[PDB]
Amino acid sequence: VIDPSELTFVQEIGSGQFGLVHLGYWLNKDKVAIKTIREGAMSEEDFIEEAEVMMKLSHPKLVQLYGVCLEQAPICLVFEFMEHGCLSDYLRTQRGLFAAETLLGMCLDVCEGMAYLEEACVIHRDLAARNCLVGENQVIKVSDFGPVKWASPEVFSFSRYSSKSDVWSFGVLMWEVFSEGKIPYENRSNSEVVEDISTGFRLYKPRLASTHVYQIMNHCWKERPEDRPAFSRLLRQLAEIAESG
C-alpha cells in the first residue's frame, strides 16, 4: 500500500540517523507519524525488505503502518500517530499519577505485543520504554521493531540475540514502568554494569512493583536464556498477578 506525497509534514518529533520522524497527516483524515530515512542511511533494499516484514506483522499491541512512500524524495514510513509520545516519555512526566494496576496494565500490553512477535520468530533487538508508544488511553504498543543496560548476558559477551534476550530486556522495561521512567543503573558504566550483573546483582525492586511483579522481573533476569519464561508464558503469569496482587 504505497503512498505518494499525500502527506502534510507538520512537525519534527524525533531524530537520529536513520531518519527524522514527523507529525503529519495523510489526506487530512489521518494524523500519522512519518519516519523518513536520510541519504546513505539505509540500502533502498534494506529498508524495502524491512517495510515489508513490518507490514506482515500485525497485532493490536503493535503500532500500525499506513503504507510507505517510495515515490521518492526522502523515502518514508507512514505509521498511525500514537497520541501520547513514547512510553518512557509518558512515565516520567505524569510520575506518581499511575496506579500499580495501571503500570502492570502497561506491561501486559507490551507483553502481548511481544508474545505475538515471539511467535512470529521476530526478535526485538532493542526492547525498551523509549521504543514503546502510549496512545488511545494508556494503550501501549511496541514500535521501532523490524544499550548494554537492557542487554542480556549472551548479548553483552556474544552479541547473541534470541527472543529470550528480549524477555531479559522486557524485564528491564518492566522496571522502567514500575520505577515510572527511571534510568536503570543510572550511576554506572557499561564496562561496569556488566560487572554487577555477571556477579548476580539485579535492578532493585521499585516501590510500585509488588513482590510478585518483582519475581517476574527476576525471572526475566535469569542468567540462562532457557531459564527465562517465554513471552507467551510471561503474558499469563502477568495476567494472574494483575487479578488481585
Side-chain angles (χ1 to χ4, degrees):
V1 56
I2 321 279
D3 239 297
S5 196
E6 310 180 319
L7 316 162
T8 284
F9 282 84
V10 193
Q11 287 303 157
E12 235 214 67
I13 69 178
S15 352
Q17 217 194 298
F18 240 64
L20 313 194
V21 179
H22 296 249
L23 156 76
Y25 284 80
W26 173 55
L27 314 171
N28 224 346
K29 233 306 86 180
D30 307 295
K31 182 178 188 176
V32 296
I34 325 189
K35 169 141 205 188
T36 59
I37 304 312
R38 261 273 92 177
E39 248 168 41
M42 250 201 297
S43 320
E44 274 203 317
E45 64 169 300
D46 208 275
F47 132 93
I48 282 183
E49 176 232 18
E50 206 175 298
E52 301 177 309
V53 42
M54 229 163 319
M55 297 176 300
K56 199 57 176 223
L57 303 184
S58 19
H59 193 261
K61 267 22 174 302
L62 291 178
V63 179
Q64 297 192 90
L65 208 45
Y66 266 101
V68 210
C69 283
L70 307 218
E71 323 240 286
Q72 326 268 169
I75 319 164
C76 76
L77 230 45
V78 197
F79 297 89
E80 56 156 315
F81 188 71
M82 292 309 293
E83 265 302 312
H84 286 315
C86 64
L87 181 49
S88 122
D89 200 15
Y90 188 73
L91 293 158
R92 266 168 162 285
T93 131
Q94 228 109 45
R95 211 175 234 177
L97 327 155
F98 296 116
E101 294 187 299
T102 310
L103 301 160
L104 183 50
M106 285 186 253
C107 285
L108 283 155
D109 274 343
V110 171
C111 200
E112 275 170 43
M114 291 294 98
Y116 168 76
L117 282 188
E118 156 168 300
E119 189 207 323
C121 290
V122 177
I123 322 306
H124 198 312
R125 315 200 182 192
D126 199 11
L127 178 69
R130 92 181 82 90
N131 298 298
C132 287
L133 299 164
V134 191
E136 313 66 47
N137 106 311
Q138 297 295 182
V139 187
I140 308 270
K141 308 188 178 186
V142 203
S143 86
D144 258 303
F145 65 97
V148 166
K149 270 183 185 180
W150 278 269
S152 36
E154 4 88 50
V155 178
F156 294 159
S157 333
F158 329 69
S159 173
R160 193 176 298 173
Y161 304 73
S162 99
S163 213
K164 285 296 188 173
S165 271
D166 279 311
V167 162
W168 175 293
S169 199
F170 175 72
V172 185
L173 174 161
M174 274 181 80
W175 188 85
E176 329 190 59
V177 167
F178 283 82
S179 48
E180 289 174 304
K182 260 170 182 174
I183 308 207
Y185 324 78
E186 189 178 299
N187 303 290
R188 261 142 160 183
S189 189
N190 291 303
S191 314
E192 173 172 55
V193 163
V194 157
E195 208 172 299
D196 306 277
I197 290 157
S198 278
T199 99
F201 165 89
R202 244 51 144 203
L203 275 166
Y204 76 69
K205 176 212 283 178
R207 46 186 199 185
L208 288 172
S210 80
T211 120
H212 265 302
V213 156
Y214 197 51
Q215 279 169 200
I216 293 198
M217 274 159 83
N218 273 294
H219 266 324
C220 303
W221 301 334
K222 293 294 185 203
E223 212 131 287
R224 300 171 187 177
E226 76 272 11
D227 279 322
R228 290 174 208 152
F231 276 120
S232 56
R233 165 134 278 70
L234 258 194
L235 186 43
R236 280 83 197 192
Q237 278 168 182
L238 292 168
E240 272 157 46
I241 294 175
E243 314 170 330
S244 187

